[model samples]
Target chain A: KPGRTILASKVAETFNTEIINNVEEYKKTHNGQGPLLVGFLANNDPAAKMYATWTQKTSESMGFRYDLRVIEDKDFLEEAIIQANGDDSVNGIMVYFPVFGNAQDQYLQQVVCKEKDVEGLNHVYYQNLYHNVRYLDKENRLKSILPCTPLAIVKILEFLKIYNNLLPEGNRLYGKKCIVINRSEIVGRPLAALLANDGATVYSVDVNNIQKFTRGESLKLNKHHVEDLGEYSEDLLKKCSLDSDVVITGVPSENYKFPTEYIKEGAVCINFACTKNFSDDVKEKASLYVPMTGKVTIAMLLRNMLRLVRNVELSKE
Target chain B: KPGRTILASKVAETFNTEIINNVEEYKKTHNGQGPLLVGFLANNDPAAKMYATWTQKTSESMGFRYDLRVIEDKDFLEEAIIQANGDDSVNGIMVYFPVFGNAQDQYLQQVVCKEKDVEGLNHVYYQNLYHNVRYLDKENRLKSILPCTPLAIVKILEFLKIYNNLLPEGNRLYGKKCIVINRSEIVGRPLAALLANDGATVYSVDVNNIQKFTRGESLKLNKHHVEDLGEYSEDLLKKCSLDSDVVITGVPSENYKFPTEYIKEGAVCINFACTKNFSDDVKEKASLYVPMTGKVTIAMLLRNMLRLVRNVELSKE
Candidate 1:
């Protein structure tokens, strides 16, 4: 019933030509030596282990070397980060998040050097990404490592030509309404900023408004007072979604059904959650919908890693 | 008439008690010696010069030593930043923005050492501000320098207890609508993030819709397709403005009047521009309004400089 189902495989393939070109250039620069990506993992959690394995395979497939260092002791995490920062042979370094715990992972992220930061966790990298430089030169552009998942989403949108089809000719995202239903730094907030920068009107919702979704509350606020009900209501959800062109939900729960009635017809919906957050019926309701999967995001992470390695090499000159 | 006129003087006074405590602690830490702030000026623009004079006075008034250096050569700006970064006597350094133009100003901001960056321009400081650390220890909080003007705006809202009066009890900013008309990094974007974190539903409009404002176009986009007129419309402006609880305008012009008809009664308005963006009649319509002035921002900058000094000292310990 869906008009179009945009597969992650299709999106990833669109960048294969560009990725291959970069990989070849990288080989030439290193005298046929593949770049090295150091993966530091602190925990034995099955999910984390699985992710590292995937990363290793992806790196090898792309003509890069992967080193997986499993550190059991939490005390050595900082030392591991220091070694990676000092190692010139290590082209990129990424510590599996929740490596020890949330606090320790953040600590390690802060310690990672900005140049070798494949995960883009360093504060300086974030600053550079958000810097007002519209156009960047090679030397200054070394800090342009975009966060992986956010970058993947942007690329998919470009590949789909969603902007051209959904927006008017000669205009991009100007005045387009977007609703992002998560506020996490890695995804929602940064994605919202990127969309805003591209001229879309973005509304960020972190909490689910049951009353709003169920139509128990009025969609419109009081004209005279303009006061909120002080909680998420079904009405709020409906109002935010009423005419939105794009809806991006990152809430990780299989049980949460996105209220399709609230979404405008011909809207594009994306679910970034590992679990299904929207109803399957939404496929019929929306013009284009992309279900969540590991494929597209993982491909993008490797692609960005390759780019970062190239930038680091150029910076040395 | 405006229901309440919140003056910068009154707002600055509320922070005086906290700032005094910080100043006293800083003096104690330095053996009764005042912390030194090095102000770097790269141009002789009359406005920039006046601002430097004001900063000097404010710094000295708060028991901090202020050194104003006028550097005219654009190439030497980076060297000046390096010298300040290396100087132990310099507790903080801030280069007047628009120094040697926008590009060089940002370059200098990036060059200034994070520990001594009082303006919060360094990338690390921004990362910390946006970092997920909700509650930071004193030592870890050393890099939590928020941009001054944005911080001042948040402080003013707190002083007025705007949320408590406007929203329901215990609700904070949940579901409350806020319209910020500027997108500058210093004020608009950061402020939007803060407000969103506080649970307000924020709509950021960067461009004015002339057609919407003039009512030349229909209020609604075409069914089955949404297209922007590539410009601001009177109707679009009204739609965004309608039922908004808080409106912040940074458009710097006396002739540009914020359409009062679009604004809900009892809305709170803030003008951060030098010229009035809202109509004079808004005084009677809005519950609270603050006319733009440089006083409170300058005061906050000095206060933040003292705090930065204390943070650096604590980090050393």
Candidate 2:
């Protein structure tokens, strides 16, 4: 049986409604100045460059100030980051990663001060994510920023009613089973952690292995644990996917296609890679199929910018 | 078949050699002024009051300055915390908990600033503990503080050579199976997370149920996962304890005793409760038994003071 198809554009529209309204509120209150997000591009990655362009396009349309500084000198990016950190005009800051991959990339991530880190890659916020800490202050006046990609996926699940509203806060996904393909630090691992923290059983599958993410036998208020299940046996992957209520994939390889045959009937399927991880046949089994997440991903980015705007405002004298 | 009895004093002595030397270094550099730790007591909980006295004795004995302020009024404690937070002379701050119990106690926990939180009960440090974050800064010049009780347990394991020194840094406990009884936020839960994060299979037991904690199929450099194993059955508890290489219990009740029959032969046993959680016969099957953690717990508290001293020194202009 065929199922309904959902476009990332529509999901992006759902969030854009609020993003646009919040930006207008900021402009009216801040003497006609919208929140400014200064993005530094130190790498020549094609996808990042395209994402930046789209960020600027939606940013201006939604009344946000988006500044793009394309740097040819990799060493100078650190200076650029320092300037943005100090500049009150820049409410948020983002840097295109991988200028010098691995540890250097990580150091650059930490270099962005937590206050202006709209990208949410800094040490402190990442710590908050894994620990399931949501607020920046005791009163819950401000919320901490989560990584954009994973935040977008979570928002998508919420819209699809996968997050049961009748359940208690923080345990909305109780008794749910999910399979997240790819364990990239930026997306897969964080998403799996997010799901498990909200009380889901997540099978995190990577190229070489599979691990299980769970809260426990009893519903924990806010705790997620992972166990190394080991070995990326095709057999194990099939079993996990077959049992999962929602299967999300983000494999980047052109040849990487998650078999639709393994997907549970009427399951929710979503993809968030540059290349499609599931072929067209996924709709045959998935009750709701999200073919792409490009639009909603960017929406989540701007959503973070709005939060950072208030976070900056709250830090005032 | 009776095994060794290791006193907490011995563990404290092992750590004192360095603590004494570090204090001397501080005195020499500062013309006889040692690091100052101000402890605030607002409640009459006997355990906390006794712990504060022990802290003061240990502090002065190790060549560090200690001040104890006993507040008669409960409402004035927040004012005390704020004053200590701004006082540069105070290198560390320790507050006796349960001043108001539950959420109020938690609010006061966050009331102490992260910089001076010697007890490691603040939101920032707890977040750091659960996320397996070790350092306070990107430069690695300062280390994040861990709760004194949970940290003392980890230190005990390290000194006992259970934490294989020859193995890689984070994976030292790889392939070790341990059982920790009691899921109190201050000790059991955090200790379980700490052990699992270091690559051990931990059975976290509470009065009502049990949970299994493991790092996974492959030795990931720094990852731990947990699963709920469901309601506690005596059979299941015995099975886990019999298979464990180490068993730790911290039940506060006087009548509570971990059954000796369940202990694996030659397994290490540790008790963190003031009232013993294990019977005397436990030593017959356990190779090493730690009957008390009072001395070592206070030692870990002061160890955090020295670290906070350097942390303050490093945050200068």
Candidate 3:
């Protein structure tokens, strides 16, 4: 009952605090017209369908103007991004990342309509983050913007600080050695950069290199661990589990299980992957594990795209 | 004596061919004035000093208007190219490729003045060949052009129709397996692209991968062979040598002794490494072995670079 109440209250709060106010102001300023938001759903995916239903109900209750389209395949998502990129009326687009292929990533890279890019996870957004430069080309310094998950992580950390009196020193996670056990662009690579930029030394390992060695073992005979096993290989995991202060893992990793012996006595493990039983493990280990099913606090992936769109749009103007 | 006689005759022939009619015409057309060529010997390298000496003597014997200065370092080369890039009076630049870390190949990329880029081994010249696109860009294409050496190899083959003749029915080499044993921009990677574009399957292996396989007798592995391996482990070389139909090795991989047993019969070995000597045993088996000495064909490198430059320039324009 508490969880359900929290969800309903959260939705109501979001509508009252931002959505309704922003839409009304936008409509009043733009000659009684507000931009339409569009949410794309995978037709066959029950989760996507559920998300669509939730979004529809939320939009209706908030009196927000929006449309929902169910795509039969992920390829259609790219076409949707393209359409959103070109259309002035479509102010926001929410896309499912995995439905698209490698080429989809390339396509998303080109979709930089900040107003239309609801979940900013475009290449142009990543490029902006990579250069550590302001989203505004005219601005000299690196813009402060996080892609989806990283931004979310930042928000969660900030919330924790405000409510729980746990402020992390140094706006950055610097001097922190983090072992990222996955290398997916959405969660791992960008997340690593965010942490690293905030002062953490992050090592990113992919699936191929994660299962090579045991804990406490030296690098395989005559091979550099990173070079042979990848940046976040089993070799690195062993070292990081012992030496690093933090460990982060993304969702969908087959070998996501972390042994107690593999973790150092005081190290913190951040399982961004939705698969881990965080409540049970965190309580047992006195560690922090954020569940994947929680409502998105910081829409980092989309926010990154938003920054790029805003930058590009502002530049053109 | 034969060498001296041939040299004298060649010099005389060169002098007579252009000097007799052109010098008088040059004097009459422009009030007897022509721009003098300035040659530089980079002061930073002893090797560059020798090259300057050789270039100076060659320029003088050709009866060209000239001055020579030894710029202490390769940076001067880039400076010269930049100056020549904009200046009309500067006619040509000839640079030796390897100057250690100073003056990267990219230094030559933006030097757009075609007449000044004598070597023509710049990125502007590389893109055309890489893409195999012709007439795509016009403004960047320079009339004064020669292919780079590795590219020149391809050009020579094309010019002589050797490439055509070598292709088995249905363009067999077009799909034939080619393993480039080095990864330098000049020889291995670029050459691999050139071959692949022409319809051959390419495997671009770096020194590390090539040096992995030990060179030893069919049945006995020797310490000398094992010790001589460079970047590629002994294992990689053994695997690739037996797999690739054509192997291209760049200059100074002299110690990369291929095991006699590993080299397949009738395999083509393109040794571009200036000083690498194939054992007579290996030479006997090679289908084609481009001589390493008296063959650093500036004309060819320039041609390739010029072609690539022309293509890119044309496309941009």
Candidate 4:
């Protein structure tokens, strides 16, 4: 049987029903002053430029205000962030990363107020993210405003649970084994924290220790252990793949292919990297294949920003 | 061959050499005005009272001012925390937990300013801990001021690496398998984050999934994975024990013995609970055993406070 492809259109529809209604409600209450998202892009990087343009279009289509500040001078980055923080009109501020030639990323990250941190890159927001505190509200509700990419992955997981019934109920991923093939802070690390918080056993693999997975040495981080393999062999990938319930991969290039044959029957696979990590061959073998695209992530970002605007308004009240 | 027991005196001596010199230097530079730590204990719980008292004595002995605010009324908790936050003299504020009959623990935690969070229970501090952001310094140096108990565990691991040479150079816990048999937020969860950040594969086990370990199912939280074992048998304890390079247990009662027979030769075991999790038999089989008592944790707490004070002072410059 051919694998089920989770289309961006399906995810967008789900967002419209489950999340966009709230944003619409919030917009109505604010007297047509919809939430404003200000984007800061320091470098002329193509990826950042593409995302900004996509985000602007998506935000406007979703009935929100979007502003892009392209900072050509490296020195003015700090001032731009400070001005955005002080501006009452800017409800959310997101700095498009790889603000290249800028050594002040750390300083710039600190300047964005946590209240307007839509991307959740600020150290304070990061702190909250690590503690599994979803929102800045006093009640600590799970209306999380997180990094767009990671949040998209989470929303996809929730979508799977609701529409496909692939996951267990009540966000209890307990006893489920997930293999995450990346360790980038932007995606893998935060995704790992979110998955762990929901109770699933996570096996995080990076290029450095990918061999260890097949070498019989259980991959460990901190004090958490990866499931042990009995022996070191090439079959380790096959065994791990066969055993996993979900496989989330973000390989940088198309040169690498996820060993889909090793994937257990009915396992969900998601590809978040720009380069195609899985081809039609793997997609056909997997139960569900979610190819995360710029459009889908932009939708999720707007959804999060709207919720954040709602949260900020609520906290003020 | 029998395992070596890490004595409290040795740890204290290590503390004096590794930590106390900095505290002494801080006092000299400040014209004898040392850091002040304020303790808030809402209930008259014996355990809380005892730890507070012990911490107070230890703080004074180390040339720091200590004040205990025994909250008679639960209603006064918020006011007291606010006062501490405003007070210039109070360098650190710690609320002894299990403030019995108080549902305001969460509220109280939020009220403590991150700067004065000596016990490192503040949500902000917890967030920083999760991201491996140690001190609140600009350089992001590794002078981590974290929760006393967990920090103590990290320090113990560091000591082992230096003295016993069991771990790699420069705090690299890469490829090491650690079994942490507690899920409490105070110790196990934070410790898991810290250990993972340092590159060790950590297995966090609790009573909820003890059977899963032996039944061939992987225990997962977030994106981290635990090794799987086949068959649900009483020998589950033995299999997990033998598999770990380092075992950290905080079993609540003395009746629960860590089956040391299953422990690998030269594996380190540390018991951090009030009740003994391991006896002489297990100690003999382990390479190093640290029976974490009130005194050791208290010393580590003071050490952390001193670092916090130092960080605060440095940030001012």
Poorest 10 consecutive residues of model 2 chain A by lDDT? A216-225
Using TM-score, give the best candidate's number: 2
Q: Candidate 2, which CAPRI tier? A: incorrect
TM-score of each: 0.51, 0.54, 0.46, 0.50
Expressed as tens digits, the lDDT of each residue in B225-275 for candidate 4 is 234334434566567667778888887775987666777888988777867
Q: What local lDDT does model 3 show for residue A274? A: 44
Off by over 4 Å in 3: A1-24, A31-33, A41-44, A48-64, A73-80, A100-115, A139-145, A162-171, A175-177, A208-239, A242-245, A260-269, A277-280, A297-316, B1-317
Going through the candidates in order, state the TM-score of chain A alone for each one. Answer: 0.82, 0.92, 0.69, 0.80
Query: What are the per-residue Cα lDDT tens digits for candidate 1 across A1-317?
Result: 56478887778777777776788887886799888889988876777688788778877887878899888755455556666778888888888766644232544566678777776676554444433232236445554767776667766767766665565532366657777787555566556656655556666666632211111112121111111223566677788787678888888665888888877888888877766888788877788888864567777777778877766566656
Give residue B140's lDDT in candidate 4 (0 to 100): 73
Q: Model-by-model lDDT, in order? A: 0.66, 0.81, 0.48, 0.67
- Full ranking by lDDT: 2, 4, 1, 3
lDDT of 2 by residue, B17-121 (tens): 888988898899888999888988998888888878888898989987899988875645655776788888888898886675433354466667788888787
- True-contact fraction in model 1 equals 0.00
